[PDB]
Amino acid sequence: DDIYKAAVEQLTEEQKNEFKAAFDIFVLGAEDGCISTKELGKVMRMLGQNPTPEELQEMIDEVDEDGSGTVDFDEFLVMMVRCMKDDSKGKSEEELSDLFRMFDKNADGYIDLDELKIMLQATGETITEDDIEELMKDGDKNNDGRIDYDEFLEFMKGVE
Amino acid sequence: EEAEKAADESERGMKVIESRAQKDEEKMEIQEIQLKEAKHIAEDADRKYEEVARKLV
Ligand SMILES: [Ca+2]
Ligand SMILES: [Ca+2]
Ligand SMILES: [Ca+2]
């Protein structure tokens, strides 16, 4: 969703207008005003490829932000921009160890919230408290107050 | 006489092709009804499948 929404916001206005037009084309005559498994499969047939039902479910689950089981415009942009794989080309294991070490400056084996916050402060961008909390949750899985190396590895999916 | 022959054949062509066109119209209506019914059934089946999959998980 991270790279997806980033690419979405990177779209231009004319592109988003074409996306809205294509959405109206896909939901043309629909009954829920959104693209569900039925409408997505209909579009896939209209194209040529055939999609597995479980695959259609898993895809709609990888684009929704609401919880409707259907694809709306806000999710149409994600479903129409996810093509480029932004989170590919994972950094080398040595580079990952370097990342963990420099995030664990005091040499302890854990990236406490203080290190993450000072890092966000150092980056220079205006860090919002909500951003801090969301990143802290994304890293620290068990919510013990620190990001270990396994939780840090988990922090690298959707990141590049 | 040739013109009369052509006129008679043409009248028959009108009757048969108009019957064809009406049959095509009825078949299009029937096909649209069947398509809509199949689409609604597929939507219902997909919703029930999603529910059953959640329950299964
Ligand atoms: Ca949705
Ligand atoms: Ca530390
Ligand atoms: Ca933790």
Tokens 């129409």 sit on residue: A80
Tell me which residue in B40, B43, B53 faces A36 most closely, judged by beta carbons. Answer: B43
By the CB < 8 Å criterion, does B49 face chain A? Answer: yes
CB atoms within 10 A of CB B19: 10
CB contacts under 8 A, B 27-46 vs A, are 39-40, 42-43, 46
- The span from the CA of A84 to the CA of A24, in Å, is 24
Reduce the DSSP state of residue A9 to 3 states and report it.
Answer: helix
A interface test, pick of B35, B50, B51 with most A CB neighbours within 10 Å? B50
Nearest residue in chain A measured CA to CA from B42: A38
Helical packing angle, A129-139 and A113-123, nearest 10°: 130
By the CB < 8 Å criterion, does A37 face chain B? Answer: yes
- The span from the CA of A30 to the CA of A52, in Å, is 21
Distance (Å) from the alpha carbon of A76 to chain B's nearest alpha carbon: 19
Rg of chain B (C-alpha set): 25
- The span from the CA of B47 to the CA of A48, in Å, is 24
Q: Answer yes or no: is A140 a known binding residue.
A: yes
Query: CB under 8 Å, gap of 24 or more: what pairs does A32-36 form?
Result: A32/A70, A33/A72, A34/A68, A34/A70, A34/A71, A34/A72, A35/A70, A35/A71, A35/A72, A35/A76, A35/A79, A36/A60, A36/A69, A36/A70, A36/A71, A36/B43, A36/B46
A21: nearest Cα among A58, A103, A98, A76: A76
Helical packing angle, A113-123 and A93-103, nearest 10°: 100
A77: nearest Cα among A85, A67, A65: A65
**Span from the CA of A74 to the centroid of ligand 1 (angstroms):** 8
In the structure encoding, which two tokens stand for residue A159, read together? 């990141």
> With the CA atoms of B1, B2, B4 and B9 taken in that order, what torsion angle do they form, in degrees rounded to the nearest 10?
140
> With the CA atoms of A45, A3, A141 and B50 taken in that order, what torsion angle do they form, in degrees rounded to the nearest 10?
-20
Q: Are A65 and A29 in contact (CB under 8 A)?
A: no
Residues in chain A with CB shorter than 8 Å from the CB of B50 are: 37, 57, 69
Q: Are A22 and A57 in contact (CB under 8 A)?
A: no
Distance (Å) from the alpha carbon of A101 to chain B's nearest alpha carbon: 39
Q: Are A112 and A105 in contact (CB under 8 A)?
A: no
Distance of CA A14 to the CA centre of its chain: 23
**Terminal CA-CA length for chain A:** 14
The angle formed by the CA atoms of residues A152, A153 and A159, to the nearest 5 degrees, is 95
Which amino acid is located at B44 in the chain? D
CB atoms within 10 A of CB A141: 13
